[PDB]
Amino acid sequence: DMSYKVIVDSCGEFTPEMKADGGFEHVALGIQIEDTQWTDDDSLKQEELLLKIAESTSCAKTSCPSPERYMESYHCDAERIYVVTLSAELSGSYNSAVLGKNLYEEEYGEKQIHVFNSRSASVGETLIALKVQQCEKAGMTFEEVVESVECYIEEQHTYFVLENLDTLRKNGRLTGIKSAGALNIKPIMGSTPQGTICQKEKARGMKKALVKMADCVAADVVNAGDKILAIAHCNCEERAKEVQRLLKERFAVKSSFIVDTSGISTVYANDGGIIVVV
Amino acid sequence: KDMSYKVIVDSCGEFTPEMKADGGFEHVALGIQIEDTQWTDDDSLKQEELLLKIAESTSCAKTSCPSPERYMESYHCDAERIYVVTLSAELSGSYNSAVLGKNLYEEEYGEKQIHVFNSRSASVGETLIALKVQQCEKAGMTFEEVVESVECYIEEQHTYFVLENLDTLRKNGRLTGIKSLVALNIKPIMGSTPQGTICQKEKARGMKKALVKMADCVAADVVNAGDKILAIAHCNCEERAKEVQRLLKERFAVKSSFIVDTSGISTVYANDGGIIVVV
Numbered sequence A: 001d002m003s004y005k006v007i008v009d010s011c012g013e014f015t016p017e018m019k020a021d022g023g024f025e026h027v028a029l030g031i032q033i034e035d036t037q038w039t040d041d042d043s044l045k046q047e048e049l050l051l052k053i054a055e056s057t058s059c060a061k062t063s064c065p066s067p068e069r070y071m072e073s074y075h076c077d078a079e080r081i082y083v084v085t086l087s088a089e090l091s092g093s094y095n096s097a098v099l100g101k102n103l104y105e106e107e108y109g110e111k112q113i114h115v116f117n118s119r120s121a122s123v124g125e126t127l128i129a130l131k132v133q134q135c136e137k138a139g140m141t142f143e144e145v146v147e148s149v150e151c152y153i154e155e156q157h158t159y160f161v162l163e164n165l166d167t168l169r170k171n172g173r174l175t176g177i178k179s180a181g182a183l184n185i186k187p188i189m190g191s192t193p194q195g196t197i198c199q200k201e202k203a204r205g206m207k208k209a210l211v212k213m214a215d216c217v218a219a220d221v222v223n224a225g226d227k228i229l230a231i232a233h234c235n236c237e238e239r240a241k242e243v244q245r246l247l248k249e250r251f252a253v254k255s256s257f258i259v260d261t262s263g264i265s266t267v268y269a270n271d272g273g274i275i276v277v278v
Numbered sequence B: 001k002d003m004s005y006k007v008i009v010d011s012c013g014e015f016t017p018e019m020k021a022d023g024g025f026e027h028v029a030l031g032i033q034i035e036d037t038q039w040t041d042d043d044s045l046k047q048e049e050l051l052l053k054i055a056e057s058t059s060c061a062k063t064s065c066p067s068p069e070r071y072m073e074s075y076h077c078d079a080e081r082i083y084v085v086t087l088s089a090e091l092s093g094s095y096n097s098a099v100l101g102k103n104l105y106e107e108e109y110g111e112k113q114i115h116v117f118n119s120r121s122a123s124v125g126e127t128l129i130a131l132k133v134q135q136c137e138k139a140g141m142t143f144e145e146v147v148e149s150v151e152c153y154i155e156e157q158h159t160y161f162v163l164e165n166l167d168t169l170r171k172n173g174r175l176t177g178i179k180s181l182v183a184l185n186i187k188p189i190m191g192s193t194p195q196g197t198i199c200q201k202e203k204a205r206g207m208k209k210a211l212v213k214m215a216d217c218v219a220a221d222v223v224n225a226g227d228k229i230l231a232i233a234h235c236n237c238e239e240r241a242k243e244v245q246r247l248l249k250e251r252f253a254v255k256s257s258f259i260v261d262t263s264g265i266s267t268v269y270a271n272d273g274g275i276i277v278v279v
């Protein structure tokens, strides 16, 4: 009985193995830069997006998926539907997925559909989708999957260091956080348990910030041998491999992987950004 | 051989007969003050004597949490691992005292595995967390693994209650954010927030329809009820507890359920006729 589908909004990256699996499906967000309106799918190559961001003087804007396209993704032959979305504190994607479930039941009746508020972004959503699959392979019931994945979400922590925080700041995703000292100061950012962004540390220069971020991850992680560590990078794979090396010096994980940022992740992480989740 | 672990629960958390007979569960008592009378909340305090004293006293009851020194002493024993389950940190100093007791322990003695769980609940909410600790230990998990699994359960755990008399919680500052209703026979359906505070979930006219609405609230929030234990605490109204149990069974199936009489602390704040439901 593998009658299930894992729906993830487009911010959550897919590894090549997940793309070849068939059980993972994306629901794409929208991206708007000046007078260009794009859909965050696999037809939007990262370089063209980064080049458009670089030329546009105006900050990029994004839009969550509509409830109707969530509902359409629920309507299929799979018995159990699991939805993984951006943090509800950072995007309307969660509320839209929940509304799509209400629309589905009005048009088609009851179905086992659960929407997971990742309280995170990017590879945070990826790891949750992988956790759903792991639970399904272990033979859990639908409600057992929900409980175990919601526990993993509670254990999961997100961290990131960017070169350019302006897109998150201008789009209202950094409210409360204090902003200009040394020009090479790099804040180490992270999630809160509620799914908002906070500042965890700071360092002058990228090399020192990556070390401090590695320390922050290691200071919070528990039972790391049971967990997969994910790293998303925006056009800086050698920086991603260095972060992986720093983290391996500090704790042992079950496994780890590195992925390129999705369209939404690229828009908000910007050129040179690094996101770590475990 | 020494016991591998002990679960310390403050006296608000009721023990089932099976837990009372298990030396792996141990209470740390709170204090109860009603007019000129001071009681330790332990098994030697009869609920009827407490209820009769409350009924006669025009003065509202007062309570006190355990001291950090008392918690520290409870940690110093032959059991290897110590788990502590306390009242919600937002409703009592019991959690802060247990954490301070741990800090004092590590300063005075060799390092020991001690973890304090903020239940963000009360009464059988603490009971079920203590049972979950035992379940995780029986599953063979490590200390860190037990801690992480129990904290996940705590986030899942929701508390609901309907009382005949909310005055003790109100007078003692435990309903700070809730608007009080004017006195036909409207009964508010109260419950926990994820932070461990009390909120009003619903309201109904009469006790019978209040229990129905509470049962609806429990059913609306519960995840994977089939694997969970549902607990019902009642203060001198066992038939009301069995009716609530019946209403919940109409809405979802659980692995098992139990009913217990309220502890001393739970009795003081739930009062005669109170009902508490946790799953």
Ligand SMILES: CCCCCC/C=C\CCCCCCCCCC(=O)O
Binding pocket: A011, A029, A061, A062, A063, A064, A086, A087, A090, A091, A092, A093, A119, A120, A121, A122, A158, A160, A173, A190, A191, A192, A195, A196, A197, A264, A265, A266, A268, A269, A275
């Ligand atoms: C709570 C932890 C968040 C970690 C953020 C990591 C940095 C960049 C990843 C992309 C974050 C995107 C957040 C804003 C998405 C808004 C999309 C929309 O609804 O328009």
Ligand SMILES: CCCCCC/C=C\CCCCCCCCCC(=O)O
Binding pocket: B012, B030, B062, B063, B064, B065, B087, B088, B091, B092, B093, B094, B120, B121, B122, B123, B159, B161, B174, B191, B192, B193, B196, B197, B198, B265, B266, B267, B269, B270, B276
């Ligand atoms: C957060 C959910 C709370 C549910 C409350 C259920 C009603 C009665 C159970 C007893 C509650 C006791 C709370 C106050 C305890 C204060 C003890 C102290 O003096 O520190």
Ligand code: NA
Binding pocket: A066, A069
């Ligand atoms: Na559309």
Ligand code: NA
Binding pocket: B058, B059, B060
């Ligand atoms: Na008084």
